[PDB]
Amino acid sequence: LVSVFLEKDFAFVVSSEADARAFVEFDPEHTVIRPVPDSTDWQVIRKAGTEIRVPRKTKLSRVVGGQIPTGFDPTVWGISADMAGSIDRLAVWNMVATVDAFLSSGFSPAEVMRYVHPSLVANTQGTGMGGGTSMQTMYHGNLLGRNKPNDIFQEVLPNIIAAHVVQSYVGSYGAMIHPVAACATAAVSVEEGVDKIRLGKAQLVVAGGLDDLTLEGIIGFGDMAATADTSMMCGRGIHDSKFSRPNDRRRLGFVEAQGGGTILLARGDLALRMGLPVLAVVAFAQSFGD
Amino acid sequence: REQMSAAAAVDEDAEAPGAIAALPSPPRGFTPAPPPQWDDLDVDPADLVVIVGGAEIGPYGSSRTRFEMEVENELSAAGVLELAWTTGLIRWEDDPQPGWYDTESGEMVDESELVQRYHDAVVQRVGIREFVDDGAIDPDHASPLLVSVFLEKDFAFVVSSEADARAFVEFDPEHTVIRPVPDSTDWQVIRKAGTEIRVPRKTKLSRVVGGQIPTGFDPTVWGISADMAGSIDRLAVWNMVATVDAFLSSGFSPAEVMRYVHPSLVANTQGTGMGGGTSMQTMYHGNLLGRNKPNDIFQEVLPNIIAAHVVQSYVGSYGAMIHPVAACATAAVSVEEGVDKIRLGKAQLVVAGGLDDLTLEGIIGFGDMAATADTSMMCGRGIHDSKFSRPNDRRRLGFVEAQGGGTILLARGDLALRMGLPVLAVVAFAQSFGDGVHTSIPAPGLGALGAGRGGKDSPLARALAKLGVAADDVAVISKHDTSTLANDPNETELHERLADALGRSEGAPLFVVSQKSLTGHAKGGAAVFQMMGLCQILRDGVIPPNRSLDCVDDELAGSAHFVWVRDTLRLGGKFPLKAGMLTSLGFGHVSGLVALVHPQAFIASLDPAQRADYQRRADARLLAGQRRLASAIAGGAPMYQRP
Amino acid sequence: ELIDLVTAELGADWPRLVAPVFDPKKAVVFDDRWASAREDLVKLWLTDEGDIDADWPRLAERFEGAGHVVATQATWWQGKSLAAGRQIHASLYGRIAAGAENPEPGRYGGEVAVVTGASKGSIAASVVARLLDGGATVIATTSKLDEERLAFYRTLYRDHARYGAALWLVAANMASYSDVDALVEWIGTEQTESLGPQSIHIKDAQTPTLLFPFAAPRVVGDLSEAGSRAEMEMKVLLWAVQRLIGGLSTIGAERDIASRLHVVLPGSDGAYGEAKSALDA
Amino acid sequence: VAGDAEAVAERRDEIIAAMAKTAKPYFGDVADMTYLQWLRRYVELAIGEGNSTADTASVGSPWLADTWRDRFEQMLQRAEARLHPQDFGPIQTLFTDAGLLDNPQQAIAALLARYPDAETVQLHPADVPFFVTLCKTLGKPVNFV
């Protein structure tokens, strides 16, 4: 909170006469205008009652969290630098997780396209919130004048993460459903993938989800106050790596982390016909209200 | 001159001696078209998903007034009364005398004078029009602008504490001089050269045209309390309004549903599109300006929490809540997930839908993206305010954004038969799709034709043949048609490919309906507009016109099947409509098909005694719903009573 | 000094009587006939069989210049009319298909005409209707272009159009030499609009053949204006139309020699004497 | 009961039974009545059998009061103006102040002959306060509650 009122001189910069006029369009009932031909502009000078925003930015230090490993370079996987620069980092992480899943179970999507038609492969990766860091990056670039791309408002959307995954990697024409429940997105994406396979609408579904903590995220969760207060836990004398203590007497809220991933559901007929490593058998998947 | 002066001046006046006034008619039942004729179906009504309810909120308000202005270009007396009630022009009071009173002047209005005194006001307040602010705040807070000035001078200050002054100068002390003032009991920072201060000038791009909610929309007149409207986000407010509208238009309460089925068989899949853009910018502007925002709005700002408010307040269902985001097909994917949950057996009544909102951030970002209608370009071309949205036209240059959406109510045919519910349509096919590899983003999608692989062996044709709908019986296409340069001819190509994949006979017409010219492109809540429009078309038989079309674009002329309509074709018993097809080509590589069949498929599935008793009970519930709306519009006993 | 000079010489309201109106971004093209043909095929089914014999030649001859698509849809409606048992409608749709197959260009093929001053219920409007009925390319000028007149000209086209007819509609003041020069440049060189990434082709290039100067001068009588009006209307006739014929004869000169423009003058006792005085200049 | 708003709605049905016992009864629920049912109930309460032997306005006029007969004509005219399918214009009505209005049975049967949906279409929700403030006004007090 800042609220100061200013009654004094306004030292200025070389602007045009039209830019000075467009600046003083809102001004002229609260000010005096004086032209300066040496700078080829005008000078606004505003009277009492004029407030100016004087942004002081505080610092609440020592937030403990569950970050990605420090120095995580996703280019070492193979993602190019312009891809990492332009595309949102949630979509970068999604590309990393998806290529990890396929090359850990020994696929390519090309073999899936050999054995089934491309309309029987889906992608239901419903990302949780969808670029909180990307949206605050858009607004901070808009304020500070950073040359943000003029299509990031288009491609900031949460479906567009796995739409990048489809338009780049898997190429599937199938049923893309991206759910948001913000703490069960992966669970509801898994149950919608499995009942699509129970229909027959698909035979290989890529489900999952991702998250991110922002400065806005930690500030809003600190205002909400169901997370672990660092001052309270260090008052109780608990070290850095043991704040998260479920089923314990000294628990006082959750620790936030960033990440997620993807799982690959498939029908048993494809598993038998391709010889695929079955990791588990899903017997029941279901969501509920309260 | 001398034989013109005689006849015109002495033209006699003849007034009738009876001469009684005309009053707005009491609520009588719906008059549908004479329904078509096909045989009994061997499908059991356990294997049918029907649309029972439905309501919307958009640029014309409710679906009743939106369809009336869509067809006949003017409101009825009931529509004028509803919009004047809703926009706060008219209250009901009874202290001098029971009757409707004017808001600003307070007089007993006559029912005979309602249209002739209030038609022009609601036509001004309702429609595609210029952006009018309804936030009661200053418009000089949210706009990107560049300032960089460097300040070398005196800093006049305020009475702060020594600790607050020290906490201010914590970041400062290497770029400044500190001087204590005991008269103000503080310090004073004075910063040297290189010190920049933010001097926020906020620009103004004026005259954005859009598809807003009616100006003066007061949702408290429904029954939602003022603290509810103040604390809760307005998307959730609109969702409560739309949901209570749908239930009390088809004549329910959720209590009767809880009487007839268990609460774990009722779901709610209302996936709201983005989820509080206005709410998030309100949070951040309160955080900057120091407005005392609630300390739990970061918790309950989430998009699932809108329909979680709906569940924790209104419906009380324990069932499977799935909230999808595709941001221009959220309603379509929520409808297809509701219908395949009913095809599983996980539920028997699903509340689907979705909502949207345009923000200042929304219009600024879409203007930077530049696929929307530029107001300067269109006024350079000389197009009026109400006709920017012009799909299938030669002078189209982008879409018009609108705010709204709504809800529809899916139910299984067994509940529909056992409760006697008004079936509005029969859902035969609902499906979403991706598009595949297109690294170049101006390359559009086409892969929604996977529903028609195999010809007659395709699942779309097989479902229509199960309901007894041949390939030529599909009559009306409610196209997506956002009025951009890209998505009109390729979507024409897509429906052409689906037609000759299903094996359409050569030269059978398809009525093209496109009401985005009427409403606007509400982003993720457009499929609810399309479904309410197509259900009402299949009810009444009429075909609405595209009133903002002048010249059909040239490269559409290869389409061998379409009929672009410009006047209200009133199809009574002259040409029966039996099916309809939607599309929604959403944002970022997502597509969605959904077919709809006339409710006589549901009436033809069952046995010929239960069909008579069913028609009795369903007509009774529709009539009771609209006369309950008439009781709420006149007397009181308001909707949405909270125990 | 200059404005009261013009006030004393010409008139008080001279700049608003002479002000330029023309702008090439506001030109309206009305060349859609296949779509309105399909919709008219539908509403012929909606109208009953009793009122078909009242317009049996006219309804048979409206669909003469149309497409292969309109032919096939006419055969579909013929088959459905045979199945339903509408014997008048069946022969009507057979006639419509047989007529719509025919490829030959009409009476007024390629006659790029320019008609000025075509308002509602007027001789110039009837000339525009018959030219579109022949299948010409009409360029109509008008004073102000709004919703009422736009609906009027659109219904005029969809009523009276045939084979390959096109109607272009511009807002041009017929009392301004700037507007006459801009109008002949517009009818001459093309108009290609370009947005950001790409361009849009609108108007090919046109060289006229006809010319119809039916320009009504002004309908204003609430000013006591007769002294300035009696020369301003004589301008609006004489020097406007001969500047116009000079420009339209100029624009297709060096490209197409032995291609001669053709003018039809109207002459409307004392009014006929004024008309003959307008003639013999 | 009287003077106690909640006690009215508490013992509502007992009051209805006692008033149906006495000779100044209640209606039905008037917001559920049909127009034909509404007019026939009014004529049943006021005229009844044409059996009264007390202070008539004249001989041959069964109405006991001019306020009762123009009460009845205003209900007939609102039935006309409400059931006709139009919302704007002045329309030629019936009932030009005659013996057709003096005979209530032929007055009702002349309404149902033109408008057949007067037997089915229930009462508009804004005609109930019309009927209450119509019975409230300034004449001989009415024969019901």
Residue numbers in the entry:
A (entry chain E): 2564 to 2853
B (entry chain B): 2419 to 3061
C (entry chain B): 2021 to 2288, 2297 to 2308, 2321
D (entry chain B): 712 to 856
Provide text from the study.
Each of the α chains has seven catalytic domains and is 3069 amino acids long. Here we report the 3.3 Å resolution structure of the ~2 MDa FAS-I from Mtb, determined by single particle cryo-EM.
A 3D map with D3 symmetry imposed was reconstructed from a final data set of 40,160 particles at 3.3 Å overall resolution with good angular coverage. The localized reconstruction revealed orientations of the ACP which were not observed in the context of the whole complex, however the resolution of the ACP within the sub-particle classes was similar to that obtained using 3D classification of the whole complex. Putative docking of ACP domains to the KS modules is partially mediated by a long loop (residues 2210–2226) that projects from the neighboring ketoacyl reductase (KR) module (KR-loop). The catalytic cleft of the ER from Mtb FAS-I is wider compared to the fungal-ER, and the flavin mononucleotide (FMN) co-factor in Mtb FAS-I is more exposed compared to the FMN in the fungal FAS-I. This difference is mostly due to the local amino acid composition rather than changes in backbone conformation. The catalytic cleft of the KR module is also much wider in Mtb FAS-I compared to fungal FAS-I. More striking is the larger inner volume of the Mtb DH catalytic chamber compared to the fungal protein. The extended catalytic clefts of the KR, DH, and ER modules may reflect evolutionary adaptation of Mtb FAS-I for producing the unusually long C26 fatty acids; larger clefts are probably required for accommodating the longer aliphatic chains, while the ACP-attached pantothenic acid reaches into the active sites.
